[PDB]
């Protein structure tokens, strides 16, 4: 794959099969041990030898990691001692150098270490790039904290009208036994509006107790016990409250919400132990500390002129981090809520935000089932408490910028009050000292956390990459998807820091400078094979909710889009930015019918353009978190009756949540393909067939990032602008 | 008058079970581990140590040490009475597998019995040293 | 008979004067050794006067506005009546156009000189009962307190409003019947809140005050599920009890919800205030609660600041018109000295015992809700007392459970006694036994009119009008009749309340003899420098003996008692009628022997016989002493004749007296030997005669 | 600080 591609001549560059990550140019025995690229990958699989060579390539050097990802198999070492390097404390990894059969050379600081009295090359710590240790006593600041779940609910008049509390309390009742933990599990509840409402739970009392703290400017804990109760001991007492809670605030006239003081009370309740805080807010905070001004929302006409409005939720997030308290924010607002400020509570506490625009129990069934499925994953996925993460790299390389939800302590120690398996992180590096002496460099991430069973564990991933000295070899190893993800994180920071214009300009100039630098080292737009999708993916970045310009997008939409860029793994960033488009009205037997009885169709991936569509058939779009099935106005009668279960195009339901399972082989094929798509991921993506000509579901159209619009270039128009600036 | 409780194996100082709640903790949890390291086969089986304003109390029964720290005004007779029923319950259905575990805090779930027993001594409703010698 | 005169007038008018014949001259309007005063009982019960459903028919003379009374000269054919306080002639209202001598209005018959009017204006207001419960007590005490409050709930009228405030370290304002969750508003016990602040933080009926008929089932379950303060008590410490904040929240609640309407704040405490404003004692047990000896040597850094907090709440509740009761039961002191002004300014009760789990408290607490012949409580609310006097009579002030309304007029004196400077007072709570003391001053038959507007327990507005008249002394023979009209019992109690008032607001034991000796020299008989010739008329003979027990009583010798006990004793003395007041100063003693039926005996050591049973009735204690020979079928009747007679009075007295069964060489025989006997009465009388026949 |  050494070829040179003319982007102006191909225009069908996107392959029909899923994009696989590049394989680093290593020796066959070194690459066979390399880490799973879904847990750890780099923008440049061939590391530049000098900073000057990196600067000439005009490509960003960095790492994207998914360290707590659910695994099929995990080696758990129980050794009496953890073998680390005597200098940089690097954990012994498959890429070290044994010399005297009881002396190993550290692959990050080149120091020779005594192989401890515990054939050492057969040891599992040297045969697995991903491994989990049992942390000894010196890795604990305190006894392992129990799992603590505190749920904070907005019960204002607007929140009651949404009806969100009915499904949240139902998901808690359904998944009460599925919450991670042992007998030490504790659970609590807080509701608020203009006042803070604590809930005491004791078996000695007939009913729970609703304790109202009305001093908003001076919050306190009204009861020393029974507010954070033991789950399995008070199971029936927790269940009765979850059945009564959605019924207490029906006639509520409280319209103001004091989110700030409520979070202050919730922090004080969890300050002794720490844990996970689940906050559910539906409107702009307007009462007490943390109040946020209203704002007029932009329209398609407004110029590019996002930052937090206050530092309250940022300061409060740092206090939560110091007590191992993480805050997950569930914003179900129908109007502006200043998420640019509210998100600071989850960013700096290793939480994550969940946005459900215009949630209503009766008026928005799409958001209703979206919240149901996301809460199913949120309450049942594994969890790690009071966690820290460190990222080490071979001497000569230096991490200079961290991306994700955490708090960077000094010495580049990532603090994670909670670590969750759906979080993604990114790092940007630079060559501080020339890698002349070495040919291989290594990267090692260590995740120290407390499990839900009360065990201190250490999860370690190690990656090894080769060093090159020619500009061509740097380009030959470029990971286009990883470069896209790192640029997205850099552009988000550029926005807060500078402006959305600078963010949009830095993204365009990343394609200009890299291809112009490539050109100056060899008519049309000539790119190496590894970068043939570089202008396409960047155009997709410039058109989606994070960075788009002449759209009618709302403020909280764009902020949540930027929060997902900073917090999601690379696979779901690529699935969201460049969805996969398949034609599904004509599935057949060329698929992965390998897995037993099931035959799974494998239709080819289509480039995101309306020109690829057709009014004669139906097209499914995999957007990562959602599956939109578009049905043409002239779809064949077979697809209507045998797949949709409908006699004519006119009779397809206004919002159709999912297809029926009908007794037709066409239905069996499409249920196979959709089931196979959803088995690839954790948050079950809801499939909506409501994309229709008249359903006002033009979200599907928004994703065709290659077509032009009255406010953005087409893909061809983009390539022409790139070539104009390359040959300037 | 406030508390701190730790259960550990005397031989290697391996922590078995503990319990702490704040609302410092760091300087008194360290001195606790200093004691677990120094204790051995010739240490007194029942002793009282006094660190500054606070006071340590411990007993040793079958290679397991039951330590408690409290404000010096806390009655010493109640401090030792609290350590015995802890040893009574712990040794009953955990003493068989104490000299076999290797992971720290292999009995974190003894947290539940600790804090329940702990409630019944802090609401009013043998040797002496100064914790500076052994350290 | 002057005795028949004094007895019949208290029965009809509920009043007793020190002098029943008044000064006729400004020359010696100063002569009074004992001032012209009255023990007035506004709601004095009497066998059935007709409830008069009129409007009281006021005198149209602007400032005067006196009530038509039997002292008014009428003219039933000119249709006029002449007011007796200002001689202006009035015209009878339309509804009186058909009156005649053959059938006259009730307010003109001298039998109806004290009369009660019912004024039905508009919608009645419901009664309000706010429970304020301490949860820092033993389970035995808290359980019995829960059972007592649940019983009183079953006695309240169906329309009355009820609220509940529990407090420990925090203060909880409970919102009753709210779905199936039962919520409450929690406040810090470390800082005070104004009525305006409390109104904003909390948001005819309320969420916190609801009718009994709609809430009694939910409130009974809640009261039965009350548990102790959940905060632990460290070793050697008292629980953190925020009495001052919980009371200021109960006062602030009613102040912004139902102001100016009968309400009773019932606070139940089982210990002293240890936190927040109003604090009485520290939180560590090693420091004992203040004592009288600790108060004078200035080792009580909480009294002055704690009293000031509750004096502010007292004036706040009294201005709004609400009543504050204090039910304190603990083994140590509780802080009555600092909180006394709340049930003193208002007409609130003050009950004091060792534990809520005794027959003493339980029976006392349910006597608060004793009903009459129609099923209504014997309590009134928002009582306004106005006094109309003749031009020559001026009001110096009042001593008793009342608050001045700062109303000015020609009837107000310049020298004020107690709570003076007004002809109008507010009594937020009153009962048929509530007795004020009004001191007058002269500057026949002058008439004093008492007008008391109050809210009946039924909700009706009522006005009791008592008009009295006492003969102006005949200028030919005054000092002889004035001495004849002297009431030694009434004057002794009226002089006693003067002594307690300045002792409780300070030597007082130097003003007492000056009036006793001067009274001896003025109305006694003696040769100069001959003490053996000194003597008193039958009108004055009991007065020195009354003042002998007074100066040695626990009302003035506060030591050997705790400050809470001294405040408790002084509380009930300032509110009782004459009959019970004499018992307090001089306990009555009955003797029981084979030789005769029960008979009263002297309060001296000479009455203690070995073969006799004694029943000493102090107002606060019923004591049965068994003589040494007696101690060791009709010596059963000798051992139960006091028990039988004690049983009847151990039920009528509202603050149920403590019962003692002691003997010679008994532990509690101390109570008999103390009030019995500067030394003895004989030495006291001889020293008195040597000074009365002495210099003037 | 941490030794991770
Ligand atoms: Zn090293
Ligand atoms: Zn008149």
Author numbering:
A (entry chain B): 347 to 464, 476 to 662, 666 to 882, 888 to 1093
B (entry chain C): 1 to 23, 29 to 130, 148 to 157
C (entry chain A): 3 to 205, 225 to 464, 475 to 537, 541 to 666, 679 to 723, 746 to 764
D (entry chain D): 1 to 4
Sentences from the paper on this structure:
The packaging of cargo transmembrane proteins into COPII-coated vesicles entails a direct interaction between COPII protein and cytoplasmically-oriented ER export signals. About a half dozen export signals have been identified to date, almost all comprising short peptide motifs, all of them binding to the Sec24 subunit of the COPII inner coat. The ΦC export signal was identified in studies of p24-family and ERGIC-53 proteins, and comprises a C-terminal signature of a pair of hydrophobic residues or a single terminal valine residue. The ΦC motif contacts a site on Sec24a that is also the binding site for the LxxLE- and DxE-class export motifs.
